[PDB]
Design an enzyme around this catalytic site. Sequence first.
Site, PDB file in Angstrom:
ATOM      1  N   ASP B  25      13.011  20.030 145.442  1.00 63.02           N
ATOM      2  CA  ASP B  25      13.238  21.721 145.087  1.00 63.02           C
ATOM      3  C   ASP B  25      13.046  22.112 143.532  1.00 63.02           C
ATOM      4  O   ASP B  25      14.085  22.212 142.856  1.00 63.02           O
ATOM      5  CB  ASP B  25      14.644  21.985 145.600  1.00 63.02           C
ATOM      6  CG  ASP B  25      14.826  23.548 146.041  1.00 63.02           C
ATOM      7  OD1 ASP B  25      14.355  24.259 145.164  1.00 63.02           O
ATOM      8  OD2 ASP B  25      15.172  23.683 147.102  1.00 63.02           O
ATOM      9  N   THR B  26      12.137  22.700 143.458  1.00 60.82           N
ATOM     10  CA  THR B  26      11.816  23.070 142.071  1.00 60.82           C
ATOM     11  C   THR B  26      12.379  24.387 141.806  1.00 60.82           C
ATOM     12  O   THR B  26      12.580  24.817 140.597  1.00 60.82           O
ATOM     13  CB  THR B  26      10.286  23.341 142.049  1.00 60.82           C
ATOM     14  OG1 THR B  26       9.758  24.377 143.086  1.00 60.82           O
ATOM     15  CG2 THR B  26       9.383  22.189 141.893  1.00 60.82           C
ATOM     16  N   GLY B  27      12.995  25.144 142.635  1.00 57.21           N
ATOM     17  CA  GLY B  27      13.798  26.260 142.580  1.00 57.21           C
ATOM     18  C   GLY B  27      15.271  25.669 142.068  1.00 57.21           C
ATOM     19  O   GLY B  27      16.222  26.706 142.041  1.00 57.21           O
TER      20      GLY B  27
HETATM   21  C1  LIG Z   1      20.433  28.009 138.732  1.00 57.08           C
HETATM   22  O1  LIG Z   1      21.136  28.259 140.380  1.00 57.08           O
HETATM   23  C2  LIG Z   1      20.337  27.098 141.122  1.00 57.08           C
HETATM   24  O2  LIG Z   1      19.634  26.457 140.664  1.00 57.08           O
HETATM   25  N1  LIG Z   1      20.952  27.139 142.330  1.00 57.08           N
HETATM   26  C3  LIG Z   1      20.201  26.402 143.167  1.00 57.08           C
HETATM   27  C4  LIG Z   1      19.628  27.188 144.406  1.00 57.08           C
HETATM   28  O3  LIG Z   1      20.091  27.864 145.164  1.00 57.08           O
HETATM   29  N2  LIG Z   1      18.381  27.655 144.053  1.00 57.08           N
HETATM   30  N3  LIG Z   1      17.812  28.881 144.383  1.00 57.08           N
HETATM   31  C5  LIG Z   1      16.484  28.765 145.057  1.00 57.08           C
HETATM   32  C6  LIG Z   1      16.466  28.209 146.789  1.00 57.08           C
HETATM   33  C7  LIG Z   1      17.357  26.782 147.003  1.00 57.08           C
HETATM   34  C8  LIG Z   1      17.343  26.308 148.255  1.00 57.08           C
HETATM   35  O4  LIG Z   1      15.760  25.853 148.392  1.00 57.08           O
HETATM   36  C9  LIG Z   1      17.961  25.148 148.589  1.00 57.08           C
HETATM   37  C10 LIG Z   1      17.918  24.769 150.131  1.00 57.08           C
HETATM   38  C11 LIG Z   1      16.852  24.070 150.696  1.00 57.08           C
HETATM   39  C12 LIG Z   1      17.037  23.810 152.052  1.00 57.08           C
HETATM   40  C13 LIG Z   1      18.028  24.126 152.649  1.00 57.08           C
HETATM   41  C14 LIG Z   1      19.191  24.834 152.136  1.00 57.08           C
HETATM   42  C15 LIG Z   1      19.177  25.146 150.787  1.00 57.08           C
HETATM   43  C16 LIG Z   1      18.256  23.771 154.179  1.00 57.08           C
HETATM   44  C17 LIG Z   1      18.643  24.763 154.862  1.00 57.08           C
HETATM   45  C18 LIG Z   1      18.037  25.983 155.270  1.00 57.08           C
HETATM   46  C19 LIG Z   1      16.751  26.408 154.759  1.00 57.08           C
HETATM   47  N4  LIG Z   1      17.076  27.339 153.622  1.00 57.08           N
HETATM   48  C20 LIG Z   1      16.002  27.640 152.714  1.00 57.08           C
HETATM   49  O5  LIG Z   1      15.098  27.285 153.027  1.00 57.08           O
HETATM   50  C21 LIG Z   1      16.369  28.308 151.576  1.00 57.08           C
HETATM   51  C22 LIG Z   1      15.468  29.569 151.311  1.00 57.08           C
HETATM   52  C23 LIG Z   1      15.762  30.655 152.793  1.00 57.08           C
HETATM   53  C24 LIG Z   1      15.709  30.257 150.051  1.00 57.08           C
HETATM   54  N5  LIG Z   1      16.189  27.483 150.477  1.00 57.08           N
HETATM   55  C25 LIG Z   1      17.110  27.299 149.321  1.00 57.08           C
HETATM   56  O6  LIG Z   1      18.353  27.990 149.595  1.00 57.08           O
HETATM   57  C26 LIG Z   1      17.927  29.854 143.498  1.00 57.08           C
HETATM   58  C27 LIG Z   1      18.954  30.504 143.326  1.00 57.08           C
HETATM   59  C28 LIG Z   1      19.367  30.524 141.936  1.00 57.08           C
HETATM   60  C29 LIG Z   1      20.523  31.053 141.407  1.00 57.08           C
HETATM   61  C30 LIG Z   1      21.384  31.540 142.049  1.00 57.08           C
HETATM   62 BR1  LIG Z   1      23.217  32.121 141.650  1.00 57.08          BR
HETATM   63  C31 LIG Z   1      21.080  31.499 143.634  1.00 57.08           C
HETATM   64  C32 LIG Z   1      19.808  30.906 144.131  1.00 57.08           C
HETATM   65  C33 LIG Z   1      20.956  25.174 143.636  1.00 57.08           C
HETATM   66  C34 LIG Z   1      22.182  25.817 144.265  1.00 57.08           C
HETATM   67  C35 LIG Z   1      20.262  24.434 145.042  1.00 57.08           C
HETATM   68  C36 LIG Z   1      21.055  24.349 142.774  1.00 57.08           C
END
Ligand SMILES: COC(=O)N[C@H](C(=O)NN(CCC[C@@]1(O)Cc2ccc(cc2)C/C=C\CNC(=O)[C@H](C(C)C)NC1=O)Cc1ccc(Br)cc1)C(C)(C)C
EC number: 3.4.23.16
Lengths: 99, 99
Positions: B25-27
């Site tokens: 996860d590059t995010g």
């Molecule tokens: C600096 O803070 C961060 O680095 N925080 C990260 C984070 O949360 N990064 N955020 C990018 C998306 C992450 C993630 O890919 C993660 C993810 C991937 C897959 C799944 C759940 C979560 C599986 C389930 C469902 C699919 N669901 C998504 O596919 C969802 C999409 C519908 C956006 N995906 C995601 O939510 C941006 C963000 C930045 C700041 C703030 Br304040 C809030 C958000 C964390 C918490 C993972 C370390």
Amino acid sequence: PQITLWQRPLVTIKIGGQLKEALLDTGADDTVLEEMSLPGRWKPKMIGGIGGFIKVRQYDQIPIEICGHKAIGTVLVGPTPTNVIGRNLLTQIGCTLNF
Amino acid sequence: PQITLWQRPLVTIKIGGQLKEALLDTGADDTVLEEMSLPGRWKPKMIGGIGGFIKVRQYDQIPIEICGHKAIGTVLVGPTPTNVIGRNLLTQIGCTLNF
Ligand SMILES: COC(=O)N[C@H](C(=O)NN(CCC[C@@]1(O)Cc2ccc(cc2)C/C=C\CNC(=O)[C@H](C(C)C)NC1=O)Cc1ccc(Br)cc1)C(C)(C)C
Ligand SMILES: [Cl-]
Ligand SMILES: [Cl-]
Ligand SMILES: [Cl-]
């Protein structure tokens, strides 16, 4: 380009006539942007991430330009803390992870 | 390898002698895993995602293999929807984004 991951991979997108910064996220299924107006039909969606779910508006067939590359796809709009470009659009611009 | 994004970029990791699946996860700044046991002392961290904030346990200097590539770094453990490998470890295994 080749984008380093020492820093957050932020790029400029063009969408709905606006320029915005967004995060390239290989872990995201969907593309989600902070509140903005988009033309056309929409329907409600709940999307989950760390911390639980948020309600968003789903717009289909929206043109977008990412880092110079044109694509079209589904854009979700709602109270995301940050603009995220997900796999649905990353595929269209030929984005890969390499190591 | 070169990983395209038409599916979720799920890979096998090894940590504490056990195999698990995790998402590249590059995010994500940080690497967050589902509940598990790790050695030593931990420190508190509050991390924010799309749905809000959670409390996690931060463990430092943990060995972790990612797709067979060795890393040793910070792993957060808490109530995440999925195991996520963030930029802290993606940089250790030499990952970039390319398009
Ligand atoms: C600096 O803070 C961060 O680095 N925080 C990260 C984070 O949360 N990064 N955020 C990018 C998306 C992450 C993630 O890919 C993660 C993810 C991937 C897959 C799944 C759940 C979560 C599986 C389930 C469902 C699919 N669901 C998504 O596919 C969802 C999409 C519908 C956006 N995906 C995601 O939510 C941006 C963000 C930045 C700041 C703030 Br304040 C809030 C958000 C964390 C918490 C993972 C370390
Ligand atoms: Cl799409
Ligand atoms: Cl392809
Ligand atoms: Cl680290």
